[PDB]
């Protein structure tokens, strides 16, 4: 269970950056589930790109293309 590695204070930190003052006790699991779903989708696309490229290593450009496919362009890792 590495999902528990996303610590409670880490989620509090992300919320603080977002501008949340007071956090309820169930926000953390819900965020864990959301992040799991999002990462699952992105990783699925990235591995699809890799397997099409016949590679075994997963390049960063594949992550970039996947994020673009989702519709979230990322500047910096080009």
């Amino acid at each position: 269970d590495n999902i528990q590695g996303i610590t409670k204070p880490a989620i509090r930190r992300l919320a603080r950056r977002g501008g949340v003052k007071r956090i309820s006790g169930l926000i953390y699991e819900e965020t864990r589930g959301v992040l799991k779903v999002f990462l699952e989708n992105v990783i699925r696309d990235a591995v699809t790109y890799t397997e099409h490229a016949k590679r075994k290593t997963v390049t960063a450009m594949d992550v970039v293309y996947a994020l673009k496919r989702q519709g979230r362009t990322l500047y910096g890792f080009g």
Partner: protein, 53 residues
């Protein structure tokens, strides 16, 4: 805009945070780059008025 943002913080080298501030502090560029995430960019400081005492 990036240089203006940099001079505003007493710096001589443009950094990704400065690009973020310049782009997001503009009416039209933000519209043009609404769906773009800048690495090491951060967000705009702002606090909702219903939270301050």
């Amino acid at each position: 805009l990036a240089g203006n943002a940099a001079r505003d913080n007493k710096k001589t080298r443009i950094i990704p945070r400065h690009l973020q501030l310049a782009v997001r502090n503009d009416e039209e560029l933000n519209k043009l780059l609404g769906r773009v995430t800048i690495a090491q960019g951060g967000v705009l400081p702002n606090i909702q008025s219903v939270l301050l005492p």
